[PDB]
Amino acid sequence: MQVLHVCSEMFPLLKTGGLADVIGALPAAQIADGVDARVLLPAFPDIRRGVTDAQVVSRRDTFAGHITLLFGHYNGVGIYLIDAPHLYDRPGSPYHDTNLFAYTDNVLRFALLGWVGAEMASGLDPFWRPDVVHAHDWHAGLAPAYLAARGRPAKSVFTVHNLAYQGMFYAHHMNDIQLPWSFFNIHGLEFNGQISFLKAGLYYADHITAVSPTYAREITEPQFAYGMEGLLQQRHREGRLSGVLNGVDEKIWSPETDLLLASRYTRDTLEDKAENKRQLQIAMGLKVDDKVPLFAVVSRLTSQKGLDLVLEALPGLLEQGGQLALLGAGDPVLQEGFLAAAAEYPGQVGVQIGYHEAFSHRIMGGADVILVPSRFEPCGLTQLYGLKYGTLPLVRRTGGLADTVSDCSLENLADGVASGFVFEDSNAWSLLRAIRRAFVLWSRPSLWRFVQRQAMAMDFSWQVAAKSYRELYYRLK
Numbered sequence: 001m002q003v004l005h006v007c008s009e010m011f012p013l014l015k016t017g018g019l020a021d022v023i024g025a026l027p028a029a030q031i032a033d034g035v036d037a038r039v040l041l042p043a044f045p046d047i048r049r050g051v052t053d054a055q056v057v058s059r060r061d062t063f064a065g066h067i068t069l070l071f072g073h074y075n076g077v078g079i080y081l082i083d084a085p086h087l088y089d090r091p092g093s094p095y096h097d098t099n100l101f102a103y104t105d106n107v108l109r110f111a112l113l114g115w116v117g118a119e120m121a122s123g124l125d126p127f128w129r130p131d132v133v134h135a136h137d138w139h140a141g142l143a144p145a146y147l148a149a150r151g152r153p154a155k156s157v158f159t160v161h162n163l164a165y166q167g168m169f170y171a172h173h174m175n176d177i178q179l180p181w182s183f184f185n186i187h188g189l190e191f192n193g194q195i196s197f198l199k200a201g202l203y204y205a206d207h208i209t210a211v212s213p214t215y216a217r218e219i220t221e222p223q224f225a226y227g228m229e230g231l232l233q234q235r236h237r238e239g240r241l242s243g244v245l246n247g248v249d250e251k252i253w254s255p256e257t258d259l260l261l262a263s264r265y266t267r268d269t270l271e272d273k274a275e276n277k278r279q280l281q282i283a284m285g286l287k288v289d290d291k292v293p294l295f296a297v298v299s300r301l302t303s304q305k306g307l308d309l310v311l312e313a314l315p316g317l318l319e320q321g322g323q324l325a326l327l328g329a330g331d332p333v334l335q336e337g338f339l340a341a342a343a344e345y346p347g348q349v350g351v352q353i354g355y356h357e358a359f360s361h362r363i364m365g366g367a368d369v370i371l372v373p374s375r376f377e378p379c380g381l382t383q384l385y386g387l388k389y390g391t392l393p394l395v396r397r398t399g400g401l402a403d404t405v406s407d408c409s410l411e412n413l414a415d416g417v418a419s420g421f422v423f424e425d426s427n428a429w430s431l432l433r434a435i436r437r438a439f440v441l442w443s444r445p446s447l448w449r450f451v452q453r454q455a456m457a458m459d460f461s462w463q464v465a466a467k468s469y470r471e472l473y474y475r476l477k
């Protein structure tokens with residue numbers, strides 16, 4: 001069984017969010033579980049420099065110009081790179097320029113990603129050919145389309161990590177991407193009078209996967225599908241939609257071995273976490289105080305994440321005696337709002353705007369609560385990281401958060417199953433109730449400790465996830 005993942009990022013080489021974490025860990029899990037998994041990525045500078053043993057497999061001409069297909073290894077997994085410097089050798093973000101504008105040739109940059117994914121099924125590499133092309137998110141959405149147009153020389157799975165990113169391009173670009181014009185149809189890749197790469201992935205794949213069981217159910221609803229629900233309802237009825245929960249990479253997210261921490265610790269030695277908290281407070285400019293709960297955010301700052309609710313809830317949180325440490329980058333309204341909060345409440349609110357990989361570990365390892373009040377959340381990896389680090393997740397019951405966190409209710413505490421704090425509605429009052437719940441449990445230190453140890457007993461394993469994908473791949477044949 002040979003599988004090629006087609007995607008635009010991979011931890012630790014290039015990361016803008018959880019997708020990178022997935023691609024960095026799943027393939028090695030699949031190999032352990034008996035599937036020859038390989039990865040296809042554009043040769044962005046950071047990726048190209050990480051894969052030091054990469055060799056030439058072939059040169060091709062393409063609707064988007066020439067590629068050199070490279071193959072090397074990273075952390076033992078086979079990595080193909082699309083070297084096309086005219087498309088991919090640009091600084092910063094893979095998706096947009098310095099001014100945060102999408103590249104004007106994005107249609108070509110990502111149509112090419114899908115195209116190479118599909119070519120691989122036809123022998124682009126004379127030495128290896130995937131049985132299944134596994135495409136991730138809109139960026140790779142054309143791969144099942146090129147496969148369909150070639151008579152499906154391999155099976156395809158499409159996994160949605162986030163349905164809110166649709167890969168919308170003007171219809172005239174059908175001219176530029178070498179797909180049958182007949183594909184521009186509602187029974188095809190057309191969506192609201194434009195090309196959608198997301199629609200393409202959803203429509204042409206043999207099977208669609210979402211990144212949690214409940215997100216898979218949610219995307220059949222208008223509220224979470226944004227127009228795509230009709231397609232998704234049909235694919236569900238056909239038995240072509242399913243949810244496979246993400247795992248966590250233990251090599252990197254384990255307080256037991258985390259080299260980025262002031263102090264390592266375990267489920268049975270949580271007293272060793274205290275030093276991380278002290279150093280976090282010092283680093284953030286917070287009052288150094290072990291009697292007070294430290295709430296935390298590590299997050300992209302977009303409306304998905306419900307962090308406007310945190311801004312609203314903040315006075316209530318501070319009034320009860322809590323602290324907030326935030327790390328994040330995104331909407332300037334959010335950035336400025338949180339910066340204003342830190343200025344207004346020095347020693348109670350610490351804020352760091354930007355992307356800081358190492359600093360997220362020090363927050364995860366020092367904080368008491370991780371706020372994930374998402375409006376929607378396909379999976380959420382930060383709350384899984386919180387569980388593992390005994391930093392109790394406070395979450396909205398939506399998507400993967402609904403699948404992974406158990407509220408501190410009477411039954412859950414009595415059944416020994418409670419692991420965090422759950423609220424229902426996307427408003428600050430509903431959030432503030434879960435926050436109050438946290439303060440109440442905080443006032444009972446041995447119950448807090450009991451919930452911490454249950455959080456740390458939760459297991460999110462890539463090799464277990466691998467087993468589900470494997471069933472899928474064999475089912476498709």
Ligand SMILES: Nc1ncnc2c1ncn2[C@@H]1O[C@H](COP(=O)(O)OP(=O)(O)O)[C@@H](O)[C@H]1O
Binds near residue numbers: 354357379
């Ligand atoms: N500002 C940041 N600095 C460092 N890491 C971040 C930052 N924002 C998000 N992350 C990381 O990116 C990943 C986010 O994944 P996830 O919670 O699945 O949400 P999303 O993929 O929607 O961003 C986590 O590993 C998280 O720690």
Ligand SMILES: O=S(=O)(O)C[C@H](O)CN1CCN(CCO)CC1
Binds near residue numbers: 095102161166
């Ligand atoms: O905004 S774009 O559509 O131009 C590019 C991406 O969709 C932005 N991302 C990166 C991939 N994503 C998953 C990150 O884990 C969603 C946000």
Ligand SMILES: OC[C@H]1O[C@H](O)[C@H](O)[C@@H](O)[C@@H]1O
Binds near residue numbers: 162246380400
């Ligand atoms: O699948 C990895 C990640 O994909 C997307 O970025 C989602 O926004 C996030 O919830 C998920 O954890």
